[PDB]
Symmetry: C2
Subunit: 374 residues, 2 copies
């Protein structure tokens, strides 16, 4: 029952997203708001109006997200952010910068420097699969970009001294036993938030607003970055907070990346997707059919219904489902089939595109070059 | 009386330089050993034979030294290393890599990132003045090179995780109040010690020996670098330890970089050089002329005589001076005049060359490019 997201906004001191804001965004774009905005999926921001101010006056801004490279599969939750960011991008016709923290993984996990980089490239393919207009998005490897940016490291250093060790010990719990690469990394994570880190596309000029869509329990991490922003004469990056995408087995967790099952993977096949949802997707319906008819299912805790909230685009069909499962008219198996019919095409479509992404294609995304926007 | 350099070799576990080694170096080069080697100025090494092995078999090696950029003047002591390294370079016809730690200064001192860089460029002019064959030496700014080396940062990261925070807390005494840029810097200092950090001149290949001439109280700093060397499949860099160049006012200190006087600066004029030596260069002679004749001067503590040890190239003239000052035949004013006649031309010659170094000249030294050697 510890789901409260409004009591969450309060303690972090961020701002709730209201109708005002969504309409302002829809007017600014001439488009219909994303369902993530309609349903309270992405409910908080930090300076989103500032971002809109800029856009309305024809003053550009850019978006920045990252991914911690890995070997395991890569699931559906990993898409919430990438999906919202693809919308925002297309909707505003704006530049997207994507950080592949191979160095972080190399520092934290047990990889070979050449390994972590490997993942950064492969994981890049999964990210391209989501569409992302090539003439608008730049995907970089920390390990690769550092040594080919006349502005990235410069910004790391500026951030590196304005952040004490104590500041990170109380935010990532670093210990005297941790390597020096770890203690100093939070700066690498922060740097892309400032426009001149990418001269190849903005040239000098630090007047460009950055927008970072991310999870809400990731806010106390961008505090640091936002605090040391004007302290170094740079604009604070705008945030857009999203809720937690639950793990099949329950909503108590957000679970893993291992524990096979527990997460629909982008590599799972139609059969596999079907199995995981029917067998593991936690059910909020009753145990017997008669008890389910009498009392109905509980939509709040049902994982299969939650997933629908994310991937079912029709607002009306979702409300029908919500209503009938609650009354008992619809049974969890029916809910499951609904979800399965939305996930199979989605995941399979991803598989299709991920096949169309060559090497001469990734090379181009990773090649720092010029782009298109306002 | 705390001068003991042999009791110093013992506690650090390094190796004394003997005749064997000097002859091996003189045979390897077909040249007469430098006076720094003849007089026990540079008396310790770590793997210098390995370096010679390589050179004899026609297998190249390279040299690496650095300088912490600054605004003040830049004195004669700052030359011991640069002088020895110019010899070694010319004598072996080998590549020299020079680190301008502007980022370090920006982190530690109170500069503007753009300031520290300024110094790196100016201080570069002083370093070029010493000769250094352009087609053999590469001078880089940490701030500039980082963002234009497909191998430098890669090596920083490799070093960054093999060195804990505790390892540096007990070597540079870092505290939880120090910024994260500081804690992680020792890696930036170490990286140039490995050949593939500079692909523009060695391309891949990490089989190239690095030699680092430096002070002997700087050994417990290169321990770290040498320890994490094979731990990452890289050759340990060779050292060549030198003694302390004393400060005019006494040998108790090595004194400063401020306290005007106390150090002959490369900007000092002939008049100024003459004044500082006569007025401040600590004297080991007696107070009265009669007492000086009877007991003689003490060469061990006389700073003016010590300076001669460094800059007077003739071994015979130096022994004459040593003998006569000790017996009392020569008076401290005569010793002073001797030193002054060696320093005025040396420092003035530097001034002359430092004027001949243009901007299209520094640009070329700083431009990572190809060089010449074995």
């Amino acid at each position: 029952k510890g789901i409260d997201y409004d009591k969450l906004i309060v303690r972090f001191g961020s701002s709730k997203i209201d109708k005002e804001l969504i309409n302002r965004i829809e007017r600014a774009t001439g488009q219909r708001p994303h369902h993530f905005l309609r349903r309270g999926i992405f409910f908080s921001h930090r300076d989103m109006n500032q971002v809109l101010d800029a856009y309305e006056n024809k003053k550009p801004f850019y978006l920045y997200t990252g991914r911690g490279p890995s070997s395991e599969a890569m699931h559906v939750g990993h898409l919430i952010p990438f999906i919202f960011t693809k919308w925002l991008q297309d909707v505003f016709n704006v530049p997207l910068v994507i950080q592949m923290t191979d160095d972080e993984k190399y520092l934290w996990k047990d990889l070979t420097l050449d390994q972590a980089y490997s993942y950064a490239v492969e994981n890049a393919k999964d990210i391209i699969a989501c569409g992302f207009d090539i003439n608008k998005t730049f995907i970089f490897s920390d390990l690769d970009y550092m040594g080919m940016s006349s502005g990235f490291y410069k910004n790391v250093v500026k951030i590196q001294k304005h952040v004490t060790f104590n500041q990170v010990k109380g935010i990532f719990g670093f210990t005297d036993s941790d390597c020096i690469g770890k203690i100093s990394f939070p700066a690498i994570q922060a740097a892309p938030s400032f426009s001149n880190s990418f001269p190849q596309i903005f040239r000098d000029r630090t007047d460009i607003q950055c927008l970072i869509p991310c999870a809400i329990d990731q806010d106390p991490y961008f505090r640091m970055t936002r605090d040391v922003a004007p302290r170094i004469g740079y604009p604070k990056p705008a945030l857009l907070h999203s809720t937690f995408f639950p793990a099949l087995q329950g909503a108590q967790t957000k679970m893993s990346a291992s524990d096979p099952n527990s997460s629909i993977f982008l590599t799972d096949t139609a059969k596999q997707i079907k199995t995981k949802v029917n067998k593991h997707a936690f059910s909020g319906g009753r145990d017997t059919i008669e008890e389910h008819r009498q009392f109905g299912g509980n939509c709040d805790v049902d994982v299969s219904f939650m997933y629908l909230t994310f991937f079912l685009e029709d607002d009306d069909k979702l409300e029908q489902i919500r209503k009938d499962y609650t009354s008992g008219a619809m049974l969890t198996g029916e809910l499951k089939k609904a979800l399965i019919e939305v996930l199979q095409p989605l995941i399979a479509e991803h598989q299709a595109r991920r096949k169309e992404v060559t090497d001469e294609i990734v090379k181009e995304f990773m090649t720092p070059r010029k782009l298109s926007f306002d």
